[PDB]
Write a protein that binds this DNA or RNA. Structure first.
Ligand SMILES: [Zn+2]
Length: 271
DNA sequence: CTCTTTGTTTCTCG
DNA sequence: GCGAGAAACAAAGA
């Protein structure tokens, strides 16, 4: 998932598990806990969930006063709230059990990660990752964004995917954003003019905020605790190879850019 | 049978 | 430093 989908999951967990005492924690795949599973089990059993935050595509569980569990879902990670008697599913890896149910993490590809760190280590953790600003008008400063684009010869799509110019875009929303802002994904960033940078800046904020309002995009695998998003119905290019651009009627094309499948209108997004 | 594709991140190689 | 390619892993389609 990308930022919109992670935020939707964050909001649903906030509503449902805040205030819950963790009775026990179990793993069938303890190796995805990067800080040590038996260590996490010992520290968190008997603690109460106080909050759930997010930074970029990362979930942050706030547990007791001084623990933060940082969870990344990578490509296929999924959480569900289940009854205590729910049967195991094939790709279930970890569970936190409460009095009235359990929070299960599943990940077919085993890419997702958990890391237990202290409250005062959360800010340093994300500085070390080099995560850029959240995609909001208040945090995403167009002036610094412009200056960074000016000095680079990186192609715009790969650069945006790095999470360093702005946090939260992945393959779906980077494609949607570039189509909205009429920029070709292979455009070298130092070639972008000020007015194009301004439309790109605003289009990143607008599309992600729309995706969040609509509960994310459900394409193949995504749902927020069993709830389908509605953003998939608004996609203009991603997965739309061979269909006609809603603006000009040209056929959406798909190419490969830096290892990634890339969907664009060849008329609206001039090379 | 092989080869390609997939909502992420982070490594090696030259 | 960089870009290209690939690994971590599983499943599905051609
Ligand atoms: Zn078009």
């Amino acid at each position: 998932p990308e930022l919109p989908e992670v935020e939707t999951v964050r909001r649903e967990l906030e509503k449902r598990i805040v205030g819950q005492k963790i009775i026990s924690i179990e793993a069938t795949y303890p190796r995805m806990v990067l800080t040590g599973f038996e260590q996490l089990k010992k520290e968190l059993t008997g603690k109460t969930i106080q909050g759930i935050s997010r930074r970029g595509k990362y979930l942050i569980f706030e547990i007791g006063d001084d623990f933060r569990l940082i969870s990344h879902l990578r490509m296929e990670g999924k959480y569900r709230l289940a009854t205590l008697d729910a049967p195991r599913e094939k790709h279930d890896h970890l569970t936190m059990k409460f009095a009235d149910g359990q929070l299960i993490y599943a990940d077919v590809r085993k890419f997702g990660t958990w890391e237990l760190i202290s409250t005062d280590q959360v800010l340093p953790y994300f500085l070390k990752k080099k995560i850029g600003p959240e995609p909001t008008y208040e945090d995403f400063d167009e002036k610094l964004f412009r200056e960074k684009l000016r000095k680079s010869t990186k192609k715009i799509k790969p650069y945006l995917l790095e999470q360093t110019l702005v946090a939260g875009l992945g393959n779906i929303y980077v494609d949607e954003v570039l189509w909205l802002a009429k920029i070709h994904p292979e455009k070298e960033t130092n070639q972008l003019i000020e007015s194009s940078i301004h439309l790109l800046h605003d289009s990143i904020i607008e599309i992600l905020q729309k995706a969040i309002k609509l509960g994310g995009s459900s394409i193949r695998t995504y749902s927020a605790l069993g709830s389908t998003g509605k953003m998939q119905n608004e996609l203009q290019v991603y997965g739309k190879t061979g269909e006609k651009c809603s603006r000009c009627g040209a056929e959406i094309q798909k190419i490969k850019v830096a290892g990634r499948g890339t969907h664009f209108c060849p008329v609206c997004q001039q090379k």
